[PDB]
Amino acid sequence: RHRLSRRVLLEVATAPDPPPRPKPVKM
Amino acid sequence: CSRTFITFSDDATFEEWFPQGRPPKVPVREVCPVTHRPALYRDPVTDIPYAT
Amino acid sequence: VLEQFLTYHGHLYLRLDGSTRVEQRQALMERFNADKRIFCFILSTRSGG
Amino acid sequence: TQRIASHSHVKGLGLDESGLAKQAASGLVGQENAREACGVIVELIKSKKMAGRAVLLAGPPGTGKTALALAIAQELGSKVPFCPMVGSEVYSTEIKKTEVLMENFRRAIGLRIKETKEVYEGEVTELTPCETENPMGGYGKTISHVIIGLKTAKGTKQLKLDPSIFESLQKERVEAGDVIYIEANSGAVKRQGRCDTYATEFDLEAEEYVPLPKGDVHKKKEIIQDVTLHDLDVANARPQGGQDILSMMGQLMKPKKTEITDKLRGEINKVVNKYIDQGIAELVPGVLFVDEVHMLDIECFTYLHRALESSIAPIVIFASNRGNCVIRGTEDITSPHGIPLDLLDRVMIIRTMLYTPQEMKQIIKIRAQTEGINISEEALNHLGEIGTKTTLRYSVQLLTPANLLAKINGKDSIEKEHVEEISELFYDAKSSAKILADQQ
Amino acid sequence: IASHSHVKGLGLDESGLAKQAASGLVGQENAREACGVIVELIKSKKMAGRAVLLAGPPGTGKTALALAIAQELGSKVPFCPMVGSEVYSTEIKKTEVLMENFRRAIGLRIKETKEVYEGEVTELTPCETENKTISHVIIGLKTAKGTKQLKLDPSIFESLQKERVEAGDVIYIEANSGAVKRQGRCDTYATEFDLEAEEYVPLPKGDVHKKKEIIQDVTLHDLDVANARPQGGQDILSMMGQLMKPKKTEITDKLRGEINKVVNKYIDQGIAELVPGVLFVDEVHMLDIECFTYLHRALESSIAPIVIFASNRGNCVIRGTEDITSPHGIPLDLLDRVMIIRTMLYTPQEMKQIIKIRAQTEGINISEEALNHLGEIGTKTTLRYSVQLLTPANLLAKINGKDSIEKEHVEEISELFYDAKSSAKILADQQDKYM
Amino acid sequence: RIERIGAHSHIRGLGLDDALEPRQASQGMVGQLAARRAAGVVLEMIREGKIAGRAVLIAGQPGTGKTAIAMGMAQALGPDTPFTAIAGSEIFSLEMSKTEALTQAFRRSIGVRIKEETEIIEGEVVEIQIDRPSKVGKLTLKTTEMETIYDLGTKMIESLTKDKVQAGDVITIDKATGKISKLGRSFTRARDYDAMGSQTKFVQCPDGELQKRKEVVHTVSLHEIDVINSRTQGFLALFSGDTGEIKSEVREQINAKVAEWREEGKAEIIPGVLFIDEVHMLDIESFSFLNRALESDMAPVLIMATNRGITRIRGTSYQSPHGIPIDLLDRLLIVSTTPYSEKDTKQILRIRCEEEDVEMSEDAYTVLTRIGLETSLRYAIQLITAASLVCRKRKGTEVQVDDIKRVYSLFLDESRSTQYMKEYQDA
C-alpha cells in the first residue's frame, strides 16, 4: 500500500519548506 | 548473636541517600480540548496533550 | 637456595649476604628485635662477624 | 478436545480389589489372565522398592499388548513416570545404542522436588535509616536497620532489612516508587520496574511493565517441580550458562552426545541422595516401555541384561509380537520371540491370548463408542463376522470410512450396506496377498 | 610389574652370538642373534623402510624379543609400539593413522637456545599512544644481581593482565613462546599482613635477562601435528577448541613438504640431528588389505623407519578380502618385503628356566620341588599359564604362613585355576549347556 | 537414602575367612566354594597390587553366580580402589574406536592419589571489621580453646566479601591459596532475628587448635588425567564423552610423569579391577588389542564373565571356547562356576527373600525350590516379589504356597512360553 510511486517521486523533487518554530505555553 | 554495624558517618554523602526522592505521582490525565479522552501525546508544535 | 626452600613453609626471613650495605645490615640488626613470625636467623662464616 | 487415537479408549485394567479382572471395565474387555498379570506389576511399581525388574508381554501381533501396556500407565497415573520407546529408536547417528539405552533407562526414573520460598512484591514508598550509637571510637553514629515501605493492592506495610540489604539496594540503583522483589531465605533483590499505576502517556521505555502488585506484600507458596534424572544429565552435559565461552559453543549441533560414568556416579547421584535424605525431593521410580523389542540387536540385549541388574534402573515392560525368529545383529541364531534365551530367562513372560468373536465384537463396540460412531446392531454384527475372518485391526478400522459413507448418503448410524461397501472398497493383508500371488 | 619386567636386552656376546641364558632371556638363540642384526641395522642410521616379521605360535617370545630390541636400542631412539587394531580410527583415515605412526616412529634431537626475563617487578607503566590503544609497556624487573627497565609488547601486557599481576610481585617471562607466569609476590611483602590469598616467592636470583640452551628431542610427527593443528599465540587461534577438533587428517602436501624442508634446514646447519627409531607393530594379522597394500609404498619410501611386525597365525583368511588366505594372515605382496624370523616353540627345559626367571623377577621364593612340578604343569599346559600360576601360589604361601612355595601350594592353585585346554574340554563336555 | 535393591544388592562381599576359606552362607554369598576361593585369591592379589595386567575369566552356566561373585568382589574391595563394571557391548561407540574405548576402560580403573600437607586456619569468626578509604581491616577468630586476631589484606578482604562470610560463622581458610570454605553456622551465628531471617541451623564451634595442619588427598584416575590434559576443554569428564586422545606424548607423558611422581613419592599407584560382563560381545580387534594392552605396566586387573562355550568369535567365523580366541584365552586364568544344588538354590532363595523383606512359609520355600530346580534360579527368584504382592493384596502376613502357585500360573518362563508358542505368532 505504501510503495513509492514514480509520480510522487517526481513531485517531491520541488522546493521544500522550513520547519515550525513553536513556543506555546497555554491551553 | 551476630550483628551488622556498617558505618559511613564521617561524611554527609552517605546520610544524603535515604531522603533522596520521596516524591509522589503527579502524571495525570492530560485532557485535550477536542474530545475529553485519555490524552495520548503532546504535539511538539502546539505543546498540547492531544488524544484523537 | 636456603631462602628458596625456607619461604615455602610460610615463614619470614631476611638476608645478610656480603653484598648488603652496612646501612642495610644495621637496619636488619635493628629489625631483629621483637620479630613477628621469625625464629631462625641466617649467618655466614666470614661476614658473620 | 483432541484427536481420537487408536488407544484413546483404554483407561485402566479394570481389576477388582481382590486382584481379579472384570468383564469390560475401564474399556478393556476379556484379557483377564494378562490384565491380572500386569496389574501385579502395577502393584510392584507402586511398591517403589524391589526395582530392576522386567516383564515381557509376548503374543501374536496386536492382540492386547500395547493396549494393556499403556493402560498400565493409566492405572499408575501421570504422577509416576512412564517412558515409551519403540525398539527402532535405539539406532542413532550421533550417539551409541548402549548410551541411548542408558539415557532411556535413567530417563524413565523421575524425581519430584519440593521447596518453599517467601516472596515480596509491592511498589516501594520510601526508605529510611535506623540510627544508633557508634560501636567504636566517636567517628560518628552507625545504622542498624533500614525501614522500607512497600505498598500493594491489599495494603501498605513497613519492613526492616539489614545494612547488607541496603548496600545491595545501593548497588542495584533503585529509587523510591519502583517495584522490587525480595526473598528472606536467599536475600537477593530483583528490580521489576515501574508500576502500571504510574503508567506514562507517551514514554516508550519497555521493561515488561509491572502491573499493580495484586496480593499481599508477603506471600509464601510451595513450588513442586517434576524433573527426571536424564534432564539433570543433559543439563550438566551441555549447560546453557552465561558468558563462559566453553558454553558459547551452543551455536553447534554438538554430536558426540554420550555421557560418562564418572559423572553419572560421583556428581548426579550424590546430590539426589542428599536431597532424599534431607527431605527436599522424593524419588519416583518409573516404568520403561519397549515395544517391538525384537528390533534390538545382540549388543543391545547384552547391555539390557547388564543394566537391568543395576540397583538404580526402573522397571521395564518389553513387548514382543514375533515367535521363533532370528536375533538381529547375529548371522543365524534363532531364539524365541526374537529375544536371546539369556534375556528371556531374566524377564517374566505374559502370553497375550487371542480374541474370540464375541470379544472382538465387544472391542469393536468400545472403539465405535470412543470414536463417536452410532453403529447399529446389524452393522456391529456384520463387522464382528467379517472380523472373525481377518484380524481385529482391519475389523475395527472399518468405522471412520463407513461413518463417512453414511453421512454422505444421509444417515446418522452405520448400516449394513455401508460396511459391506467399505469392505469391498478396501482390502486386508490376506486379501491383498491373494491378489499378489495370483498376479506375477 | 609383570609380563615384560624380566627382559632387559638380547643378551648377545661381543661377536653378536646369542648367549645361552643372560639378560633375562633363555633359548631362542637363532632369533636373538638375528634380532642383533636388526638392532645393528637400526643403530647404523643408514637404511630406511626395512621390515622384519617375528613369526611364531603364541607365547614363543616374539614380543619379548621385540621389547628386548628396544631395551638394547635404549631410550634415545623413539620406539613406537602399536597394535594392528589401532588403524581402525573413527576420526582420521585408516591410512592416515598408519602414516602418522610411521612418522612418530622417527626421532629428531635438536639443541635450541631460548631467552628468559625474570625478576621482582618494581613498576609496570603502559606507554600510551594514539592509533587509541596502548603502544608499549615499560616493566622494571629487579633481581638479586641487578635491575633493568625493559620494554615489552602489548600482548605481553595483556598476558600480565590475565595473570592479574600487580607491582612488586615476581613473574617469569619468556620471549620465544610469549607465556608469562606469576610465581607469586616477593617474599619481602609477606610481612605486610597476617594472612593473604597470595603465593609468596623470594627475589629471583641471577641476571634479569638470561639465555639458556636445551637439547630437546621430538619426533617428525610432533612437528607434523604442531604445523597441522597450530596453537601459537598473539591471536585468537584458541578457536581451535571448536573449529573442527578431531585428529587433523594430515595431508601429504605438508607432511612430505614444508616439514621435511624445515627439518633439513635445521639439520644441515648443525642445530638438529636425525634420530631414526623403531616401529614395532604387534598383532599385524588383523590389518586390512588396504593397510597391507599401503605398507608396500610405506616400506618402499626413502624415509620410513625400521618396522617390526609380529605374526601369530599359521594360515588363515586375510582381513578385508573374506575369500583369500595367505601365510601369517599377510598378503604375499607385503610378505615379500620383510625378513621373517622364526620364534621356536619352547621345550620343557627352557620353559623351566623361564619360569624360574619370572619367579625371581616377581619377588617369589619358589622351592625346587614346586619349580619342578611347574615343569609338568607347563608341559601339560601353556607356558604363559604355568608362569601365571606363580603369584597366586605366593599369596597362598603367605596365607598359610610358609616362607616358600611348596608342592601343595602350586597344586591348590592349579586346581583352583583351570587352563585354556581344560576349559575347552569342559565346554565340549557341557556343549548344550553354555549359552 | 532411596536406592532400590537390585538383583545383586543382597551380596555384601565374599564370605571368606582370614585364610581365604569360603564359608557356606556368610556375607550374602551361598555355595560356589571353589569359585569363591579363587575370587578371594585374586582379590588378595589385587589388594596387594604389585603386579599389573592380570586377567581372570569366570566362566559358567547361565545364572550360577558369576556376576554375583563379581559384585561380591567389588563390595569386598570397597572404595579407595577403582572398580569399573562394563558390559562387552558398551565399547561399540560411534565417536571413538573400540581400541580407544578399551584404553579408556583400562585407564579409568587406575587411581593416582596426591597427598598434600597444606595448612589452614579453622575457627569461628567473631568480628570482620573493614574500612574502605585500598580497604584495610581485621578479623577475630575464635575456637573453644583460644581466640586470635588477624590483619586482613586486600585480596583476603576481597575473597571474604565475595564469599559473604559474617560473624558467628565457622570457616576454614587455606593459607596457601586463600580459599575460604564456610562449614556452617555456630550457635553465636544467631542473627538476633528481627528481620527477614529463615535460617537457624546451628552447630558446635570448631575444637582443637586455631592454626592446625591437616592432610588433604586428591584422587583422580589416569583416564581423568589424560582427558583433562587432552585439550583446553578440561571438563569432558562431565561435559560429554567426546574423546579420542591421540597416543602421542599426551598419554605417554601422563605415564612418564606418574612414574616420576611415584619415584619421588608424590603419588605412587593404586591398581584397580575391570569387570567385563558378557565379554563375548567384544570383537576380534578388541581381543587382539587386549592381547598387548594387558602387557602394559599401567594395566589394572580384569575379570571377564562368560556364558558361551564352543561358539564362533564375533567379527569372524572361528570356533573358539568362550567365544574368545585362544590367543587371549592363554593369558587368562579360568575359574568355572558350578550349578547350585537343591540346598544351595533353597538357601539362595531364602537369603534373597529375607533381603527383599518377604516372609515365606516352610512349604513356600519347598515349592519355590522345586520350581527353581525345574526352571531357572532367576525365574524362581523373580517369583518371590510377584508372590508377595498377591499376599499383600489379600492382606496376608507371609507368602504361602497358594500365592506362589497362583503367580506361577500367572507368569510364564521361557520354556513354557516356547511350548505355548504353538501358533505362527508372526515368525
Ligand SMILES: Nc1ncnc2c1ncn2[C@@H]1O[C@H](COP(=O)(O)OP(=O)(O)O)[C@@H](O)[C@H]1O
Ligand atoms: N480387550 C480389548 N478391548 C478393546 N479393544 C481392544 C482390546 N484388545 C485390543 N483392542 C484393540 O485392538 C487394537 C490393536 O491392538 P494393539 O495394541 O495394536 O495390538 P498389537 O500391537 O499386537 O497389534 C487397538 O487399537 C485396541 O483398540
Ligand SMILES: Nc1ncnc2c1ncn2[C@@H]1O[C@H](COP(=O)(O)OP(=O)(O)O)[C@@H](O)[C@H]1O
Ligand atoms: N627366552 C625366554 N626367557 C624367559 N622367559 C620367556 C622367554 N620366552 C618367553 N618367555 C616368557 O613367555 C611369556 C610369553 O612369551 P611372549 O613373548 O608373549 O611370546 P609371544 O610373543 O609369541 O606371544 C612371557 O611372559 C615371558 O615371560
Ligand SMILES: Nc1ncnc2c1ncn2[C@@H]1O[C@H](COP(=O)(O)OP(=O)(O)O)[C@@H](O)[C@H]1O
Ligand atoms: N552363592 C549364592 N548365594 C546367594 N545368592 C546367589 C548365589 N549364587 C547365585 N545367587 C543369586 O542368583 C541370582 C542369579 O544368579 P547370578 O548370580 O546372576 O548367576 P549368573 O550370573 O550365572 O546368572 C542372583 O540374584 C544371585 O543373588
